[PDB]
């Protein structure tokens, strides 16, 4: 996955804190972290609650987790948090192509390509890159910005070896969707 | 560098735009980008102005750029922009150590290590990782959070091969700075 979210918790406060994930709670001492990234299916990550020892305050986490990515959930007293982006769940294989999408529409866009998802790419913003084996890839774009009758199926060009591309999503002259491809110098990250 | 900033410009609007960098101007047609990442010394990146054809509006990029990182400057009509982080300027060599810093102080912190900089890491926040060859590394931490008389020089432990670490910065019992090292699962990107 693809569809899996990896989360590590790092307690940077001065007391014991608990993060309640669906089906599993982790209590950490101050100045300590979970030894591993815990893995979840995005659809099963319904809510995340954070609490502190003694303090009755329970805080719910703003669902800012991207599938296919690792995150560090920073926690501190009194029930404070910050989600830090830690990059991809998997190291891209030699020869894979990095693809990111840029949304120029006034509504969010979701892109699904070869089992990978770029969810709710905001207006005039870029997603991070995700990596794919070479060759033409089919993908879909779903948004409220265009008529439901508009074409949602697209195809990437013949992806070279180890390249990186930015796919810019815009309105076509007929009012539907169009994608312009740009080659970028490969990311080092 | 290290102390270098890489910037590519991508015009995602519907008209011609100009980006004035110190000593060099780039004019882009709609749906076009600069063919390369232009490189600048952070200290020499005094200001960046963005303008559109016909529209008298000139916008200054007050938004920061991180040294040692690549960026995509997204531009669109009338004089809009967004700085997108594209990762590191250099691909980490096999065996290098990814190191990031977490600031738990109430003031921003700046860390300088082996020619690399982590500038203004905000309160209860993490920097991205930067990579270094193996062995003990000397580093400095400068902040307004502690007395100027406090020790600002630190040393990393004898760091292993391909190992990643998070250095958590906190106030020591004597009122000065203290750093706790955590080993991490190495980042993939």
Author numbering:
A (entry chain A), B (entry chain B): 391 to 579
Show me the paper's own sentences about this structure.
Mammals obtain nitrogen via the uptake of di- and tri-peptides in the gastrointestinal tract through the action of PepT1 and PepT2, which are members of the POT family of proton-coupled oligopeptide transporters. However, a key structural difference exists between bacterial and mammalian homologs with only the latter containing a large extracellular domain, the function of which is currently unknown. Here, we present the crystal structure of the extracellular domain from both PepT1 and PepT2 that reveal two immunoglobulin-like folds connected in tandem, providing structural insight into mammalian peptide transport. Functional and biophysical studies demonstrate that these domains interact with the intestinal protease trypsin, suggesting a role in clustering proteolytic activity to the site of peptide transport in eukaryotic cells.
We subsequently identified the ECD from Mus musculus, consisting of residues 391–580, as being stable and amenable to structural and biophysical analysis. This domain was crystallized and its structure determined using the single anomalous dispersion (SAD) method of phasing using mercury-derivatized protein. The structure was refined to a resolution of 2.1 Å with final Rwork and Rfree of 19.7% and 23.8%, respectively. The crystallographic asymmetric unit of the PepT1ECD crystal contained two monomers that formed a head-to-tail dimer, related by a two-fold non-crystallographic symmetry axis, whereas the PepT2ECD construct was crystallized in a monomeric state. Analytical ultracentrifugation on the purified ECDs show that both PepT1ECD and PepT2ECD are monomers in solution. This led us to suspect that the head-to-tail dimer observed in the asymmetric unit was the result of crystallization and that the physiological state of the ECD in PepT1 is monomeric, as shown for the PepT2ECD. The crystal structures revealed that in the PepT1ECD there exist two conserved salt bridge interactions stabilizing the interface between lobe 1 and lobe 2, mediated by Asp574-Lys398 and Asp476-Arg490, whereas in PepT2ECD only one equivalent salt bridge interaction is present, between Asp505 and Arg538. Consistent with this analysis, 3D envelopes of the ECD generated using DAMMIF show that PepT1ECD forms a compact shape ∼48 Å in length whereas PepT2ECD is more elongated, approximately 61 Å in length. From this panel of potential ligands we observed binding only for the intestinal protease trypsin with both mouse PepT1ECD (KD 80 ± 0.8 μM) and rat PepT2ECD (KD 165 ± 0.5 μM). We identified two highly conserved charged residues, Asp550 and Glu573 in PepT1ECD and Asp576 and Glu599 in PepT2ECD, located on one face of the ECD structure.
